[PDB]
Design an enzyme around this catalytic site. Structure first.
Site, PDB file in Angstrom:
ATOM      1  CG  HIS B  41      -0.587   0.109   2.513  1.00  0.00           C
ATOM      2  ND1 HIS B  41      -0.157   1.302   3.069  1.00  0.00           N
ATOM      3  CD2 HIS B  41      -0.518  -0.862   3.454  1.00  0.00           C
ATOM      4  CE1 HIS B  41       0.178   1.013   4.318  1.00  0.00           C
ATOM      5  NE2 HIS B  41      -0.023  -0.276   4.595  1.00  0.00           N
ATOM      6  N   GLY B 143       2.362   5.741  10.239  1.00  0.00           N
ATOM      7  CA  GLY B 143       3.764   5.628   9.843  1.00  0.00           C
ATOM      8  C   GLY B 143       4.494   4.402  10.354  1.00  0.00           C
ATOM      9  CB  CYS B 145       2.570   0.872   7.453  1.00  0.00           C
ATOM     10  SG  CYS B 145       0.869   1.163   7.988  1.00  0.00           S
TER      11      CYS B 145
HETATM   12  C1  LIG Z   1      -4.543   8.025  12.026  1.00  0.00           C
HETATM   13  O1  LIG Z   1      -4.115   7.038  11.081  1.00  0.00           O
HETATM   14  C2  LIG Z   1      -3.558   5.867  11.544  1.00  0.00           C
HETATM   15  C3  LIG Z   1      -3.394   5.642  12.916  1.00  0.00           C
HETATM   16  C4  LIG Z   1      -2.814   4.492  13.363  1.00  0.00           C
HETATM   17  C5  LIG Z   1      -2.380   3.497  12.453  1.00  0.00           C
HETATM   18  C6  LIG Z   1      -1.776   2.283  12.862  1.00  0.00           C
HETATM   19  N1  LIG Z   1      -1.383   1.330  12.028  1.00  0.00           N
HETATM   20  C7  LIG Z   1      -1.590   1.530  10.718  1.00  0.00           C
HETATM   21  C8  LIG Z   1      -2.186   2.663  10.161  1.00  0.00           C
HETATM   22  N2  LIG Z   1      -2.562   2.786   8.805  1.00  0.00           N
HETATM   23  C9  LIG Z   1      -3.641   2.248   8.184  1.00  0.00           C
HETATM   24  O2  LIG Z   1      -4.363   1.407   8.706  1.00  0.00           O
HETATM   25  C10 LIG Z   1      -3.937   2.824   6.799  1.00  0.00           C
HETATM   26  C11 LIG Z   1      -4.798   4.112   6.958  1.00  0.00           C
HETATM   27  C12 LIG Z   1      -6.068   4.057   6.133  1.00  0.00           C
HETATM   28  O3  LIG Z   1      -6.756   2.798   6.245  1.00  0.00           O
HETATM   29  C13 LIG Z   1      -5.988   1.746   5.818  1.00  0.00           C
HETATM   30  C14 LIG Z   1      -6.646   0.748   5.119  1.00  0.00           C
HETATM   31  C15 LIG Z   1      -5.920  -0.307   4.594  1.00  0.00           C
HETATM   32  C16 LIG Z   1      -4.558  -0.354   4.794  1.00  0.00           C
HETATM   33 CL1  LIG Z   1      -3.676  -1.779   4.310  1.00  0.00          CL
HETATM   34  C17 LIG Z   1      -3.889   0.647   5.472  1.00  0.00           C
HETATM   35  C18 LIG Z   1      -4.607   1.714   6.012  1.00  0.00           C
HETATM   36  C19 LIG Z   1      -2.572   3.709  11.057  1.00  0.00           C
HETATM   37  C20 LIG Z   1      -3.158   4.926  10.627  1.00  0.00           C
END
Ligand SMILES: COc1ccc2cncc(NC(=O)[C@@H]3CCOc4ccc(Cl)cc43)c2c1
EC number: 3.4.19.12
Lengths: 305, 300
Positions: B41, B143, B145
């Protein structure tokens, strides 16, 4: 989101772990520059350890008596000295992996990561706090002596602990990297008991702020309290007194959450007198006191090392 | 003595964390040999988040679109490929700090260490378990990820997780290092909800054995139970069924403590029945399920 007990990345510390052997005893050493630091009880027999004269045992030692092993390579000791309960073995080679470091003595309530080692080899890393009674509730087996406790400031490792022994209650005692014991402990097999432990109040408050940041608010209440009234209640429940300095330190979390420190103190006050009522805060049924205010800010802001 | 939630030393993994930037998106990558692994992604835009076609977005990319940064040094990408939900960026330099490693897929209940990173830089390390619902209860901000989950079993790093997303309940979803998602999750921003989570029963039993080893015995009882009767009670508290394999695995702890597995199962039945009564086991007021039988034996 999420709140975990998080240790500092141990890499910079792992590159310093060596195995120190003196006779039959083998424990860990911290190799920084051209010196290896380890507990002075490595020069002790079970005969000596009851009432040991370390100054006398050490004068009877020669540099080759210390087998220092960094990986499979054996380092050669060119000098040996003692500073308080820590032994310093001067070596011919400076550790190429020596990080930016400094020796710091911590105060109760303060937290640090521990890099548990066996035979100069790191086996695990965990986070723990210096209890108000000066013990650490660690996880240590035989051979873990010489394991170090540390914090990381930017790119600088602050070494604050070295493991020496375990008390009869399963808790642990150690020194700073200057050999000064934390608490009223001595480095010998004698009757030693930790004092009655108390809860680290500023850390419990920091942990409640972290819960609010992560969406847990059931414990919040409309009430506020005076710092004096809170402390009178805190004493009754074996909690450490909260000073004005603790209130100041909790300032950024108070601003980020819009919950004044004395407002959180009244939430903590109700929790102590009434209890959880079958509920949890951050997946815990107890008031957690092992997260300092700077730990809570670091984890909820993403500070990297 | 003592019992802690202990992570593996993260050094070997820190030496692999790099920053991968593709356009406006910046996440972490795992640099092993001459390949950088990161979630696919990183090639998505705002328009390509609900239903991106990754095969199509990736064919439109050139090696010079990926900015890979290892420390202050910028690595050069010489090839780009995708294996399931993970992107593989072939680079011109092999990581000098590459450890002895292997990619392993874990099963629910298995524990691993997570090295949380932001902008290719390690911020912290913690221990967690793969939940029975296939999510991890991590601590991750925007961030993080590309942060990896691992276990270091003697000298060799077993990479078992890469962070990809956060579900609406604050729990996390990711894949193995072969890009295969754990659970029924997709790397799209479509409506995804984790199934109701359950307690890892074998892990709670392993943790009760650790407590007995460390002198905590208040919860023990004169009772034993059948494996079937225990399982009927367990589901009523949302506990995972205990299989004969779990009983076999708990065998060495049963022998070390002289408390048969079904005897500990009757202690757990009673613990679920009354609760703690203001007491704690190993300093905790709840039954811990993020310690496996392997971790309990290793730590003790
Ligand atoms: C405030 O945004 C955050 C907070 C904590 C977060 C903690 N771990 C990961 C984040 N990112 C995501 O989950 C992205 C944001 C959009 O939604 C998706 C949907 C699918 C995929 Cl694969 C990735 C994501 C995080 C994103």
């Amino acid at each position: 989101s999420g709140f975990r007990k998080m240790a500092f990345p141990s890499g910079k510390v792992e590159g310093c772990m060596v195995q120190v052997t003196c006779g039959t005893t083998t424990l860990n050493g911290l190799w920084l520059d051209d010196v290896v630091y380890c507990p002075r009880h490595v020069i002790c027999t079970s005969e000596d350890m009851l009432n040991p004269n370390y100054e006398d045992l050490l004068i009877r030692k020669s540099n080759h008596n210390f087998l220092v092993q960094a990986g499979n390579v054996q380092l050669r000791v060119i000098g040996h000295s003692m500073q308080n309960c820590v032994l310093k073995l001067k070596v011919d080679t400076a550790n190429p992996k020596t990080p930016k470091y400094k020796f710091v003595r911590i105060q109760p309530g303060q937290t640090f990561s521990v890099l548990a080692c066996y035979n100069g080899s790191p086996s695990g890393v965990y986070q723990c706090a210096m209890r108000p009674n000066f013990t650490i509730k660690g996880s240590f087996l035989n051979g873990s002596c010489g394991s170090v406790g540390f914090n990381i400031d930017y790119d600088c490792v602050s070494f604050c602990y070295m493991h020496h022994m375990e008390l009869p209650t399963g808790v642990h005692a150690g020194t700073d990297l200057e050999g000064n014991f934390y608490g009223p402990f001595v480095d010998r097999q004698t009757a030693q008991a930790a004092g009655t432990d108390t809860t680290i109040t500023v850390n419990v408050l920091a942990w409640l702020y972290a819960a609010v940041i992560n969406g847990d608010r059931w414990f919040l209440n409309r009430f506020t309290t005076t710092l004096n009234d809170f402390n009178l209640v805190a004493m009754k429940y074996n909690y450490e007194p909260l000073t004005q300095d603790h209130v100041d330190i909790l300032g950024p979390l108070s601003a980020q959450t819009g919950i004044a420190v004395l407002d959180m103190c009244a939430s903590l006050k109700e929790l102590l007198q009434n209890g959880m009522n079958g509920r949890t805060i951050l997946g815990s049924a107890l008031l957690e006191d092992e997260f300092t205010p700077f730990d809570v800010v670091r984890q909820c802001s993403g500070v990297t090392f």
